[PDB]
Amino acid sequence: SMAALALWAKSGNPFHPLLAHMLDTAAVALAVLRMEPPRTRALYAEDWGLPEEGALAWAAALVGLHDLGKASPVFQAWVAHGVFTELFLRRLLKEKGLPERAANDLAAALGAHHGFPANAEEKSRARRHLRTEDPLWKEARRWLLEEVFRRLGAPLPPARPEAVLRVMALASFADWVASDPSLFPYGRDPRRGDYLKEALRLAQEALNRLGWPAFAKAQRREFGELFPYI
Secondary structure, three states, X not given: OHHHHHXXXXXXXXXXXXXXXXXXXXXXXXXXXXXXXXXXXXXXXXXXXXXXXXXXXXXXXXXXXXXXXXXXXXXXXXXXXXXXXXXXXXXXXXXXXXXXXXXXXXXXXXXXXXXXXXXXXXXXXXXXXXXXXXXXXXXXHHHHHHHHHHHHOOOOOOOOHHHHHHXXXXXXXXXXXHOOOOOOOOOOOOOOOOHHHHHHHHHHHHXXXXXXXXXXXXXXXXXXXXXXXX
8 A cells, every 4th residue: 555655654753754744844834935025925926937825835845845755665664865855856746747857956956965966876876775665665655745735735837046946945944944843743643634734833833933032143045035044
């Protein structure tokens, strides 16, 4: 069963499914895009040729896939998991209908080196692992991507470098926030219909806390969007 394999994959702790971490990451992305200035949100709408509401859902779902590279036996019970995320997304984003060049760039945006593509030696090592894994893993990773896109209600766009870099920086920040169990406690069940509403509430609380005077001390401006400088 590919669904069981997909749900069994863990992130960061045996009691925290990878899917829970991916949905938490998407929830932080969506919450912080809603708080960005109107100029920033209009940039996303223009980047992707979507009404603003669809553009933010698209971007949030993409960012949720940052740790999709963990959906491999290599990371469950050396090359960084982000190299796997990049290889998986090059294929998976094209199957969803994105044109080759946009898929390849977004795959690197969500990879191991903050938007710069994995090198030949990293990819050779990863592909060595991929050749000997159980084939069900390839199916499980497609299942996980479909679950996030479906949960977020993400539409496909009908990609300029700044658009890709905007997703890169957003994914770096959202994955960081969602990775802190003090903000996003382990043990929530992502099979539940109420999971995303609860993850959005936790995201709003976390963004509020990270902004408090003893944490945030200035702002980081990157590619026309803003984050707290911690």
